[PDB]
Each structure stands twice: as C-alpha cells, then as structure tokens.
Amino acid sequence: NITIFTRILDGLLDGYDNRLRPGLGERITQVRTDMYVNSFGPVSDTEMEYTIDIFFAQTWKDERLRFKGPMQRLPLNNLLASKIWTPDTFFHNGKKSFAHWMTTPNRMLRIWNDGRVLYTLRLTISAECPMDLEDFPMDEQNCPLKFGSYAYPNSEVVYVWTNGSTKSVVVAEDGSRLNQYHLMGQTVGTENISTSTGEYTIMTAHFHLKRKIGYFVIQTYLPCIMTVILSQVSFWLNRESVAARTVFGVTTVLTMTTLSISARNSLPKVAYATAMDWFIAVCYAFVFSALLEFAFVNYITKSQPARAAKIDKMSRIVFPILFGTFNLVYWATYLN
Amino acid sequence: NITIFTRILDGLLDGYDNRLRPGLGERITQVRTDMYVNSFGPVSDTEMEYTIDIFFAQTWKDERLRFKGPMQRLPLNNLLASKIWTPDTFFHNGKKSFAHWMTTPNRMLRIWNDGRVLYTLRLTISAECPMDLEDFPMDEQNCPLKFGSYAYPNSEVVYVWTNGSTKSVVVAEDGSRLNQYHLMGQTVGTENISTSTGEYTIMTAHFHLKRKIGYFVIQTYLPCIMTVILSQVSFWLNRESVAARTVFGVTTVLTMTTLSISARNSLPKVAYATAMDWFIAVCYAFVFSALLEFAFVNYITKSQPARAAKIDKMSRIVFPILFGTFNLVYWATYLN
Amino acid sequence: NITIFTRILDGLLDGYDNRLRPGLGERITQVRTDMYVNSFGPVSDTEMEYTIDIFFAQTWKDERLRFKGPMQRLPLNNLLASKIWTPDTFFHNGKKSFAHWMTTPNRMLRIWNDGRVLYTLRLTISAECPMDLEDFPMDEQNCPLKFGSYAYPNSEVVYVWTNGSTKSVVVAEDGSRLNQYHLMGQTVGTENISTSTGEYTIMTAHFHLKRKIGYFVIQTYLPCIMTVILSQVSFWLNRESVAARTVFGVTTVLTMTTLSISARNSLPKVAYATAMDWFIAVCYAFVFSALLEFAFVNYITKSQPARAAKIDKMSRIVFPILFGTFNLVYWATYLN
Amino acid sequence: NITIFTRILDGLLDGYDNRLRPGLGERITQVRTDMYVNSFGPVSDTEMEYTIDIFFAQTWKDERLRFKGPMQRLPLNNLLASKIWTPDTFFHNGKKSFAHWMTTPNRMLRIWNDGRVLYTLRLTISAECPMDLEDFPMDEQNCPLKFGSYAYPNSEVVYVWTNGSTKSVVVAEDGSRLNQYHLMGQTVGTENISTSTGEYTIMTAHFHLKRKIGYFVIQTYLPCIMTVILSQVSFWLNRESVAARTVFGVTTVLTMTTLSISARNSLPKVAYATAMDWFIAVCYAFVFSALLEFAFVNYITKSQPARAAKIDKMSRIVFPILFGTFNLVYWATYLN
Amino acid sequence: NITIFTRILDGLLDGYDNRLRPGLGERITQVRTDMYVNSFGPVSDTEMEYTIDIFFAQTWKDERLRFKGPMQRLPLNNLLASKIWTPDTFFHNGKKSFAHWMTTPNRMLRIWNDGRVLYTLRLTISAECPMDLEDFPMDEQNCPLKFGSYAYPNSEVVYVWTNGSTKSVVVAEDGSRLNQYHLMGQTVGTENISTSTGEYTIMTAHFHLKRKIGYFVIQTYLPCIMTVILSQVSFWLNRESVAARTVFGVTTVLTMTTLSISARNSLPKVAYATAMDWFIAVCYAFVFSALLEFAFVNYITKSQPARAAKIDKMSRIVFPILFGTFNLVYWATYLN
Ligand SMILES: CCOC(=O)c1ncn2c1[C@@H]1CCCN1C(=O)c1cc(OC)ccc1-2
Ligand SMILES: CCOC(=O)c1ncn2c1[C@@H]1CCCN1C(=O)c1cc(OC)ccc1-2
Ligand SMILES: CCOC(=O)c1ncn2c1[C@@H]1CCCN1C(=O)c1cc(OC)ccc1-2
Ligand SMILES: CCOC(=O)c1ncn2c1[C@@H]1CCCN1C(=O)c1cc(OC)ccc1-2
Ligand SMILES: CCOC(=O)c1ncn2c1[C@@H]1CCCN1C(=O)c1cc(OC)ccc1-2
Ligand SMILES: *[C@@H]1O[C@H](CO)[C@@H](O)[C@H](O)[C@H]1NC(C)=O
Ligand SMILES: *[C@@H]1O[C@H](CO)[C@@H](O)[C@H](O)[C@H]1NC(C)=O
Ligand SMILES: *[C@@H]1O[C@H](CO)[C@@H](O)[C@H](O)[C@H]1NC(C)=O
Ligand SMILES: *[C@@H]1O[C@H](CO)[C@@H](O)[C@H](O)[C@H]1NC(C)=O
Ligand SMILES: *[C@@H]1O[C@H](CO)[C@@H](O)[C@H](O)[C@H]1NC(C)=O
C-alpha cells in the first residue's frame, strides 16, 4: 500500500534531467510567485538595509512529472527538491540572504497528477533600502524587493504574480511590528530590464513605511524646547546680576551643541541638512541670540540705561512668541 | 555476537524510503514532543529577541522499523538519522536557529522492537519576543515558542505534548538565570491555524518573565531622586545669593536632561512614553519649577520682599512633601 | 614496503561498522579523557561566558581494530576518523563550540596492535560561567567545564580521568594570561546525573579564577577618592564666599553621579548592590553631606555665627578622619 | 524533442577532464572579463576596507565543448559548472569574499556551438582600500580592485578586458550611493607582476572617490566656529566682571577639547595631523588666546588701566578679523 | 595531445593512498616552508590578537608521484589536492583561521618528474599576540607565528625554512601598513617541544612592531598639557577673586579626571600602571596642587597677607618650570 508511492517516485526520476527547464524549445516556462511575510525585521537606517523573513513560494507546470495513482497529491520535503529542476530565483537587491536549516531545511515539494509543482522556501533577506532623509523624521520610505531569474531570460522564464495584489503578498498581523516605523501597505509590480546578458523580467514588491514620531520628541525636540525656555529665564533677572545671567547663556549654548552631536550619532552620516537639523539650528539661534542681548545690554547699561531696560522687558515677550510661532509653522509644515 | 546488530540495521534499511512518512494513506502520524531547557539565554530588549538552548525531542511510531533480537533497544547516533524519515519540524517565530556539531552532532536515535522511535536534538533558538513596554520596568513579558510541521498539514502529522505540562517542558535549576528577568513559570498549548497551504497544528510554549528591579534604581531613579533633593537645597540659601542659587537650578536641570538621554540609550527606541519616562518628567518639573520660584522671587524681591520671603520659606516644606507623596503613588501604583 | 600498511587499513575496515560501539552487549565501554589548555580566552562578564581553547583527547579500547605488522603504531589523520566509531562527546554547558579546519582539520588517530585508540581534537568552547558579583571586584569565580556522552548512558559508556588531576588537565604557562583574572588552579571530578533519557556520567573540570585588582582602582576608586578630597577643600574657604563653596558641592556631587553610571556600563546589569556600589554610595554621602553643612552654615551664619564657625573648623578634621577610617574597614573587610 | 539536449550534455562530459585547462601545451588560454557593479557597499574608514557587490563574468574558448544541434545556445545553471574546468580567479587584495547561495547559487553557464563559454558569478568583496588622510576631509581616494589567476601564470592564462573601459566596467545608477562619498568615475588597467612562483597578469580596476563635505560641517566645524564666537563675547564685557568673563574662557576651552576627542572617535587612529586637526588647533588658540588677554588685562588693570582698556577695545575687532581671514585661506586652500 | 596528461594523472592515483605519508618506515619526511605576507591586518590591542593574510607554501618530496612525459611540470588546482597526501600543518597559536573560497579555493598543486611537490595556500590567521604594556605607548611588540604538524612528530615530519630568513619570509611593501604600528623587520627560528603525545618541531616567525606615536599626543597628552597651563593662569589672578580662581581649579581637575577614563576606554583593561598613566597622574597633581595653593592662600590672606602674596608670585614661576622639566625627563627616559 505504501510501496506504490515508492515506484511512482522512481518512475518520475527515470529519464528526468534536472539541468533542463520544462518545455525547453517548445514553449516559455511560466512561474507564479506568492509571498507571505512572517515577520518584518528591523530597518537599520545606518546601513540603509532592512531584514525581512518570508515564505517565498513558486508554482510552475512540468509535464515530465505526470503520474497516475490513488492519491492526487504527493507531499514531500527537501530530499527530492535537489533531484528535480527548480528556477534560479535570486534577489537583485539582497545583500545577504540565508535560509534556516534547523530542525530540517524548511522546504516543501507538492506535485499533482497534471504535473503542477509547488515549491515554498523560507528566507531571511537583508535587502538594501535607500532613504532620502530630507524630511526626517517626517519621512516616508518605500523599500522595494526585487527578484528574478539569474540565468533564464524573459524569453524562457517569466514570473507573474498570482491572483490580485492582496493575495500575492500577505503580511502577518504580528509580523509588521517596527519600533520606529508603521507598515502602511504593500504593492507589487512587474517590469522588463534590458541587460547585456539579455532581457529579464523583474518582480518588484514595495512596502510603504511611515516613520512613527515620539521617540525623537523625548530624545531631541523636548530637551531643545526646554533649553530655550531655560535661556529665556535670564530675561527676568536683574541686569547687574552679570554672573547669574552669564551661566544661562553659556550653559544653554553648550547644551544645544552636545544635543546636536548626540542626536546625529544614531542618524546616518548624511551630507545634507535634515528637518531636525534646521529645528536645532533655530533653537540654537534663540539661546545664542539671548546671550547677545545680555552682552549688548551690559555694554550700554552705563551710558543709556533707559534703552537697556526697555530691551530687557521687551525680550521677555518677543522671544517666547517667536519660538512658539516657529513651532506651529515647523510642525504644521511637515505634519500635513 | 556483534554481527547480529549489523544484520538488523541492514534489514531495516532494505526497502525503506526516507521520503515517505510512516503510515502514509493509512492513518495520521502522531508525534509526541518533550522539551528540556538546558539554559535560557539572554533576553535582548533592543532586538526584541531571546536566546534559548533546549534538547528538543520527538517520539513517533513507525512499523517499518520493527525488528526482533536479543536486545530490546538500539541506541545509535546521527549517522543513521539521515537514513530514515524524520518530521520537518521548524519554529514559526525563530529568526536564526543553529545546532552544535562539536565534538559530534548532538543527536540520538533509539528504536524499540514495536517500532517506536525517539529522536532528540540540541538547538539554540534566537526567537523573537515582542514586548509592550508600557509599564516598564514594572512589566511582565510572556515570550512564546511556536513550532510545527513545515510540509505536513494537520491531516497528516499531528503534534501533541506528552503527559502533563510539567513533564512536557522542563527548565534546569541553573538554566533560568537572567540578569534582568525572573522565570516565573512555563505553560504549553496547542492550536490549529488555517493557511493557504492548509491547516497546520501549532505547539506553543509560553515563558512567564518578571523583570527584576534594582538595576534601574541605581542607574536612573536614584540619580534623579538625589538631583531633586540637590535643587531643594537652594531654598535654604539667601535670596541675595543670586549666583549661588543659579548654579543649582541650571546644573540640576541639565543633569536631569542628560540622564533621560543616557537612560534610553539601552532602552529600545519605542515611540511612546514609559512609566520611567513619566517619573523623569515629574522629577524634571520639580527642578525646573524650583528655578522658576527663584526667578520669580528675584523679580519681586525689590517691590514686596515680604511675599518673596514667605514663598521661599514655604517652598522649603511644600516641595519635599510633594516629591515624597508622588513617589508613594508612583511606586504603589505599579508595585501592586 | 609501504603497500603493507595499505592492506592493514583495508582489512580493519572490512566488516567494521562505525554505528556500533565496541564491545556492544558484552561489556561497558571505558573512555579515558585527557585535556590540555593551549590558551584560556577572555572571560566576558557581560555575557557570563568564557572562551577556552583545548586539545581534547579520548582513549578507548576496540578489539575490532587489532592488527599485526612490523610497525607497532599507525599514525593517521582525520581521513580515517569518520570511517570508524567515535564517542558522541559534547559539552553540557557549551553555548557555541567550533573546531579549526585550517590548514587541515586538527585531528589525530593513533592505533596500536592491542586495539587501543587515541583520538585528539582541537576545540574552542564558548562556555557559560555564571558569577555571583556580591563581592565584586573582590570576587572569586569557579568556572566549570562539563562534558559527556549525548546518546550512550552510564551503563554503556563511562568517562574517567587518566592518572591524577595534574596530568588529566594541563594549562600552558603562556595560555593562562587574562587581563582581569588570575588562574589560581584547576580541579576535576566525576558524577552521575539522573535524566529522563537515562543516567549519564558527567566529567566536570573547575578553574579557579581570582580577579586582579588595579584596573578599577585607576578607573573608579581613585576618581571617587580624589573627588571627596576636592569637596573637603570647601571647608577651608570663608563662609561669606557663598559662590566659591557652591561650585565644589555641586560639581563634586555631579562628578560622583556620572562615575557611578560610567562605572556600571562595563559591569553586567545585575539587579543587586555590589561592594563597589556601596563604596560609591558612601563617597556620595560625604560630598553630599559637605554641601548640607555649607547650606546649614549659611542659614545660621547671621543668627549665631559662633556655632557656624565652630562647625566649619570641626568639619575640616572630622570628615577626613571618617573617610580614611572607612577605607581601612572597606579594604580590610574584603582583602582578608 | 527534449531528450536531444540530454544526449549532447552527456557527449561533452564524455572524455572531458575538468582538471586540465583548454588548449594545454598547444596555445595560451585567453580569458575576457567583464564586470557590472550592482551596488557599491559602504566604505569603512576605520578598517580601510570597502564592500562591493558585482556580477563578475569571464569568457573563454574551449574546443572540447563543441556540439551540433538545432539550438545554438545552451543556457544552464551551477549544476554543470563544477563538471567542467573554470579559471581559479581570485582577488589579490580581497580580505573576505563570499557569494550568495539563496535561493540558488547565482551562477550561469552558457555554451555556443563554436565552444565559447560564458560564466558569470555574483560576489561580495570586502577589499582593502588604504587611504592617505592628509587632506581629510578634502581628500580623494582611489580604491583599486585587483584580481587574477592563482595557479596559472601569464604564460598559460591571460586576462584581458573586453571592448573599452566603459563596457568592461559598468556601475548601476542607484548602486553608487554612498553617504559620505561620490563615485567620480572608474578606470581599468592590466600589468604583469614578477613573483617567485612565476609571472601573473593582474587586472586592476580603480574607482575614483570624492568625499562629500557637509556632515563634518554640522559635526565639527560649526560647533568650533560658534565656540570661537562665544569666547569673543567676553571682549564686550566689563573688565571688573572677572567672574563673568572667566566662565567664557574656561567653558569654551573645554568645549573645544571635547570636540577634538569626539571628532576623532569616528576618524581612523592615524598617527599624523589632518587638515581638520589644524583647524581645531587654530580655533583652540583663539579661545585660549582670548583667556590670556583677559588674564593679562586683569593683571595690569590696577597699574595702567589706560592700556588695559585699549587692548580690550582692540581685541573686539582684531580677533574676529583674524578668524574670518583664516577661514578664507583654509577653505580656499583645500577647495581649489 | 591533451589526452596524454589525463593518462598520467590516472596512473599516479592508481595504487596511491592519501592516508600514508611518503617514505613511511623508510626515512623521515622533510618539508620546506616559505611564507609571503600579502597584507598585515590590524593589530587589536583589546583582544591581544592580530590578523595576517599570507600565501603559505610547503614543499616536499614524494616518489609515488614520479612520471615521465613531454611536459616537465603539471600545474593544477585544488581538485587534485584532496586526492593526495598533504601535511596536517596548523598554527599552535591561531585562534581562528579561515581560507578564501571565492571565486575558487585559492590553492595550487605543482608536481615535477622527480616527484617534488609544491602546495601553496592562502590563509587569514587571527593569531594571539600577548603584549606587555609597561612602557605604553613607547612599547615594542614581538608578535610570533607558530605552526607545525598536528599528528606527525619530529621523528616523522620535519619542517625547515628554505634558503635564508629574507627569502623564507617576505612582506609586501603595501602590506605592512598599520595605523598605529611600524613593521621594523621579521625573524624566523626552529625548535623542538617535548609533549606527552611526542616531540614536534615548531616553526616560529617573529614580527618586530614599533608603535608609532602621534595619535595619543593629539588624544591624551596635548589636552593634559594644555589643561595644566590653564590652571596656571589662576596664579596671575587677584587673590580676592575667589570665585574666578575657583572655576579654574575645579574645572581643570574634572577635565583631567574624564580624560583618564576616556583615554583608557580604548586601552586594554590591564591591571597595572602604564607610562601614560603616570604622566596623567603627574599632570593631575599639578592642577590639584594649584587648587591647594589657592585654598591655602585664601586661608591666611587675612592674617599674614605678605607671605600669601609671595607664594602667589613664586607659584607663577615654580610651577611652569617643574612641568617643563618633568616633560624632558619623561620624554627622554622613554625616547632613548
Ligand atoms: C503562501 C505559500 O505558503 C507558504 O509560503 C508557506 N510555506 C510554509 N508555510 C506557509 C504558509 C503560508 C501562509 C502561512 N504559512 C505558514 O506560516 C505555515 C505554517 C505552518 O504551520 C506550522 C506550516 C507551513 C507554513
Ligand atoms: C527530554 C528528552 O531528552 C533530552 O532532551 C535529552 N537529550 C539529550 N540529553 C537529554 C536529557 C533530558 C533531560 C536532561 N538531559 C540532558 O541534559 C542530557 C544529559 C546527558 O549527560 C551528559 C546526556 C544526554 C542528555
Ligand atoms: C594531551 C593529548 O595530546 C593533545 O591534546 C595534543 N593534540 C595535539 N597536540 C597535543 C599536545 C598535548 C600537549 C601539548 N600538545 C601540543 O600542543 C601539540 C603540539 C604539536 O606540535 C606542533 C603537535 C600536536 C600537539
Ligand atoms: C555583464 C555580464 O552579465 C552579468 O554580470 C550578469 N549576471 C547576471 N545578470 C547580469 C547582468 C549584467 C548587466 C545587469 N545584469 C543583471 O543585473 C542581471 C539581471 C537579471 O534579471 C533579474 C538577471 C541576471 C543578471
Ligand atoms: C611563495 C610561494 O608562492 C606563494 O605563496 C603564492 N601563492 C600564490 N601566489 C603566490 C606568490 C608568492 C609571491 C607573490 N605571490 C602572489 O601574490 C601571487 C600572485 C598571483 O598573481 C595574481 C598569483 C599567485 C600568487
Ligand atoms: C515584458 O515582456 C513580456 C514578453 O511576453 C511582455 O508580455 C510584457 O508586457 C513586458 N512587460 C513590460 C512592462 O513591458
Ligand atoms: C485541531 O484539529 C484536530 C483534528 O483532529 C482536532 O482534534 C483538534 O481538536 C483541533 N484543535 C483545535 C484547538 O481546534
Ligand atoms: C556512577 O556510576 C558508576 C556505575 O559503575 C559507579 O561506579 C560510580 O561510583 C557512580 N558515581 C557516583 C558519583 O555515584
Ligand atoms: C604582459 O605579458 C604579456 C605576454 O604576452 C605581454 O603581451 C604584455 O604586453 C605584458 N604587459 C605588460 C604591461 O608588460
Ligand atoms: C630538533 O630535532 C632534530 C632531530 O633531527 C635535530 O636535528 C634538531 O637539531 C633539533 N632542534 C633543536 C633546536 O634541538
């Protein structure tokens, strides 16, 4: 009763060459690909890469595997995978892709009577996702995932998504858990690229990422906001208290300087100004400007005290208003 | 006397196919799984992963391995493991699982006359354990461990725990040693998940983790507590000592600011406020508020000194009481 | 003359099964283990692990390998190691063990006429060594090394050390070079553990480690000691110099606070107080207490200056004596 | 119709030795190499290495593979690659080179009737790129890429670029994306090196790198520039304000000191002065010199106040001019 | 014409056993080793290890490989390397050695008619180089490289350097490029070690390393030197300026303290004082002593101002002279 299956497997492997694609010189092999994202690994901004774990699957038709028997399906494992022909699928953007071999190589091979073949594999792809940090942290990233044949051009092997976009790519509810990103959706597409070796079909899947704010607020913005308010306290102190007001100006300026250096330690070493950088620079101007007002006041406090006192009183009102007004423009400009 | 065993092994391998599960098309294969945790590796909060070393074991019935001989058991090693059929067990949540091959691949294969098979393997699983750090550090984590068949659905292979929960999962006394966690217990369960490929049984084991407090007390809370007390010292200084009291307010505020940044360096970059963050913010208000009182006093110390002196004396009593009262509410709220 | 050896090897492999232990069902296999430590790798306190490189060797008797020839010994290499049976030795505590394959797999196989077999292997074991940091840095660590059979219980395979403890375990003179530890000696032992799978003999080797002090003295203790002395300088300053004495108290307190945070960065995140922590806390009290005395003096310097002056003069003598006395108790308590 | 291809493959492998190069003892094997850079990985300055992902390809003529059939080309995969002879190409400067095996080993093997063979491979090379950081960050780096035969000297195997330089080496538009470098172009060349083993042809490809400035401006230069301006504010303060001006000099000097240490943390530990180091040193002199002027003024402010006041007024103009003039020389000298 | 080579290879492998060394029981195998250092990797002081890439080569005589043919040499690749016998050479001090397999395993096998065999291999050795940091950074390190047979004692296999020391070991001109070391030369030697397994010949190569100074000057020495000068500025300030002089003493002392902690972060955690540590301690005394003089002056400035003024004037001259004199002794003592 079990020996029947053994004979079927031997017959299929008899006269079957794994080095030749099905329907060679007779038609164009058609492969249907479906992907399931078990978990979306962390997105490393420093290296412009992200880690994703998926159960990649491919379906194709092979007439050489036709068989007749009481059972309409033949579930199997990785043992027979190497005995037959499989597409040389690879990721054009993947920097380091490895599979899982424990406890057993996570592979499946299901064959039907008509010859249809299902082959699912588990992979962890450390693909590269370039990011334009011009509106950072109010930036949206579209990380793609490109894969295709390595040796078979479009004229021989063609990859096509199965059913609609939703069924083609599926993400687990708990898989999309990123500490500093939100998975807003997924999209798929196909295209042909012209290469010296030939034309190859490219299967591209794009993931929409919306960075979640709140970590930088407690890390960079809030210390800067409170630092500016700290400097404004000097405006409420007496002019003759030269030493007391000097500490506020010097300490606040240095505090802002170290925050900028510390803030960018985690940020990638990008050679352009980000939105956060402008906010820090503006905050630096307020604290720096406050010290200049105190220095200017102390220079003329002996000649014309009347004007010096007026400026100090005016500064107590003008500076808070400008800082508050600036925030509304800054936050509204990006949060819209 | 020894040659008898050699003949038995040859007979079993004669006509035995390792690509077909036992009892194919006749019944449903039943597998009993028992796990022993040699050591519970570190729990990395930054990557939301934990490392665990276990001696995973599986038991199943195979009639093709029946034999008769003087010895009722046939202890063996990994050499014969590849010669027979084994389940394609895998961890649905494991991110990187590897075995130990030194000195020899840590595997066993014991076979009885009735055909029962025992197969134990040693593995190190770097599984992912998402955590909700809303009550951090007063948070309880339930890290699961999900595993099951990769190619055989529930209709063909079924996993069931052996005996009770205590016997099914065992943790070594010295294995459960975490520098910042306590292993409060273990639990097991089974469920069926509906997938496009089919229905698969899932064996889930949950470990109860109770974070141990005391490291953060010496790291974050105590410096904050002493910093607040340091600011309150300014209330005991003379009002005319403008410079002396200025140092306390400025230095304390900056000290709190750097602690918040330093404290969250180890903490995961979560985009929400934790319990520790609120405690820091409240402590920041006290030190920041103290400076405001000094600034307010210095502004009116010339017009109405009577009220200014009253506030300074009152501040010496009100502020310590509020800080002490706040701690009791904060600690009692979470420690209960 | 050389062809004679070739025939001998072929004869031994004829009818020899590597899947069966020698003397199966006739006696209990006896294995003698000798270890040589080429180099004792670094001891990582953060991960509670240590790296050790050893030339592990095993000796056992096998009658199936008996041969007669002009040469009494047959030196060989790893090529024939896989062709015969070897014990499934493994480390019960090893977290990641790997061998060296360059230039050639470092293995030997020597066989005598009587059938005795010598098999030496080179390994690098990243074992786990839990430590109780209650007296840190005045702590002594006893890192064990447990290994034994994985599939053969005590009733089949037994491990016994050869000769005495000194000969069984040998450490190279230059191998025991640790930047923050001293290798005070080695010890060995054997025991039987009862397991669900059966009873297995355990070969445990313990290494005595005595942490060497001097790195923390220049890193933590000395800055703390000098910081306390710095605060005491304020006692020699005039009371009216409110600003001058304020800097000492504030700066010293903050300096101690940052040292505690910086000091524990390298230390493991243990949720209990160490001996160093108590020393820091005591030093923190002295600097903190000095500020309180200055604040207390400034509060009553106008009402009863006589008592205020007396306290300041007394503080110059009392505080240094207490700090000096405390050190003698602290150092003597642990250094004894 | 498909069986025809199978017979052709068997015929070619019949009597074909993969250990012998084509045309042995009859001519000199000629190999044409073409390279495509999929992505130029990060350039690590600390380790003087860079990561590059390329689709390395080699073409050569082999008469032993001649065949006749309806199809003029025989696309294949890695399965037949090991069955034939391939050059032992290697990178003379590569420190760690690994290929990608997922989903399938990324290799191709195309054979024509005339016997021409195309063999493309995907590799990730962590080559070493020594850099002379004398004009850092205004430095241009020329990272080479050397490869050639390991066992076949120039008299047997010769490597030659195909077509022109542009076609020989191609870089993807999105591949050349470096956070702190610009890919200004590529160049190729060939040379013969005399070695004890023999003469080997070397294929060298040089990549022109132009470091992009702007990250260090926000990291090092700007804090230094603002720090110098901060010190100059003391020149506008009254001489009798000894305490107020003391803070500026001390705080600014320490701020510059920490920036130099922090700035070089990312920079490689080079034992020579860079252009940035000189800029920091000059900025340090200005802040340090300003303190000396204040100290000098305070020393003679009692004897000859007339000269002291003149210096203070003059310093307000001289110091800003020198700092501004120095920047123009510094920036113009390197930015030209 | 090409088939002749194929027959020769088959004949040599006929009756050839790779498990037996040449001339077994007839003589002692002699192996000549020559080494070429392609590049000397970084020397990691923290782990007391260094990385080196070499083209290790071995030459020996084997009469079993004698052949007659038109070609006097048979260049080959790694394919035939495993088919013959090769020495089990290994590095007695190497902690992790791996080869390069891309594009092809970098190995060669050349055989002459007389039977001489040449076998060159490329390796990357992460050997351990213990260092005595007593004169750090004015320290000279002699990193050795020990290798020899693992299974064949001196009585069977002997390693001898070929020709002189210069030819035996060769270092590329661009290979010896270390950011903090100079390669002053190389030396070789041979010795016999007595081991329980037997006597083995050891081939030791020593590399002379002279640490290059200049990185620590800009990192540690210069900030310390300028810090001491900064403290001496207080000697030029008026005694009554208690607050002004207090900042210099406190700020300088703390600045020195943090430099010592920061300086040793990169330095290995050695439990003894280095030359740099003594320099820091001496610099700490000067800044600390200066504060004591100010405190002492302020204590007696009211009783006997005459002596207080004299000390302040004297301090302006004595302290700079002692610091300058100390440097000459310190630098001359080690730089000689
Ligand atoms: C989409 C094609 O199928 C796959 O991609 C694929 N390949 C393997 N497994 C799947 C399926 C897909 C949907 C969810 N899913 C699993 O997560 C899973 C769970 C199992 O239960 C322990 C066993 C196997 C799988
Ligand atoms: C639960 C099924 O058995 C396993 O999971 C299993 N597999 C291997 N070993 C075990 C057992 C389980 C209980 C403790 N235990 C060992 O730790 C151990 C110790 C030995 O002694 C050196 C030898 C073998 C094992
Ligand atoms: C104790 C059983 O023997 C071993 O554990 C063992 N195994 C290999 N080698 C040894 C010996 C042991 C003592 C020192 N020792 C080596 O270090 C060594 C040195 C050699 O010379 C290059 C060659 C081989 C070895
Ligand atoms: C220059 C010799 O050919 C190669 O170096 C080579 N080798 C493989 N593939 C290429 C080509 C070269 C140009 C771009 N290019 C690919 O990126 C590519 C894209 C494909 O489509 C999914 C499939 C294969 C390749
Ligand atoms: C000393 C024994 O020979 C070796 O150690 C050895 N082994 C391989 N290759 C060498 C030689 C040694 C001298 C320089 N040298 C190479 O760098 C090299 C360069 C080549 O050209 C691309 C091809 C092969 C080698
Ligand atoms: C790619 O080529 C195939 C050839 O059949 C064609 O059907 C398809 O439309 C092409 N795709 C694009 C985007 O041009
Ligand atoms: C899963 O399916 C099996 C089928 O036999 C059933 O016995 C079991 O009760 C199911 N489990 C759950 C949780 O529904
Ligand atoms: C372990 O078991 C063996 C069985 O022969 C016995 O000889 C030995 O004494 C036992 N060891 C201990 C520690 O009980
Ligand atoms: C290298 O050697 C070949 C031998 O044919 C010669 O043609 C070529 O010109 C040489 N290259 C150089 C740069 O000398
Ligand atoms: C090592 O042993 C060999 C044996 O032939 C001898 O020739 C050689 O001199 C010995 N070397 C030393 C350093 O004793």
Plain-language structure description:
In chain A, the strands form 2 sheets. In chain A, strands 1, 2, 4, 5, 6, 8 and 9 form a 7-stranded mixed sheet that branches. In chain A, strands 3-7-11-10 form a 4-stranded antiparallel sheet. The first copy, chain A, is rod-shaped. The N and C termini of chain A lie far apart (68 Å). In chain A, a hairpin with a 4-residue loop joins β1 and β2 (49-61). In chain A, 34% of the residues lie in helices and 30% in strands. The first copy, chain A, folds into 2 domains: 3-210, Neurotransmitter-gated ion-channel ligand-binding domain (Acetylcholine Binding Protein, Chain: A), CATH 2.70.170; 215-334, Neurotransmitter-gated ion-channel transmembrane domain (Methane Monooxygenase Hydroxylase, Chain G, domain 1, Up-down Bundle), CATH 1.20.58. Chain A has helices spanning 3-13, 165-168, 215-232, 242-266, 275-300, 305-334; strands at residues 29-44, 49-61, 89-91, 94-99, 107-111, 116-128, 140-149, 157-161, 169-171, 182-195, 198-210. Chain A is built from 6 helices and 11 strands. In chain A, α3 packs antiparallel against α4 (242-266), α4 (242-266) packs antiparallel against α5 (275-300) and α5 runs antiparallel to α6 (305-334). Chain A is of the alpha+beta class. The complex binds the ligand CCOC(=O)c1ncn2c1[C@@H]1CCCN1C(=O)c1cc(OC)ccc1-2 (5 copies) and 2-acetamido-2-deoxy-beta-D-glucopyranose (5 copies). One copy of the ligand CCOC(=O)c1ncn2c1[C@@H]1CCCN1C(=O)c1cc(OC)ccc1-2 sits between chains D (92, 148-150, 195-197, 200, 202) and E (34, 36, 38, 55, 57, 120). Chains A, B, C, D, E: Glycans are attached at residues 1, 101, 163, 192. Chains A, B, C, D, E: It catalyses: chloride(in) = chloride(out). Chains A, B, C, D, E: The chain crosses the membrane at residues 217-237, 243-264, 314-334. Chains A, B, C, D, E: Disulfide bonds join 129-143. Chains A, B, C, D, E: It is found in: Postsynaptic cell membrane; Cell membrane.
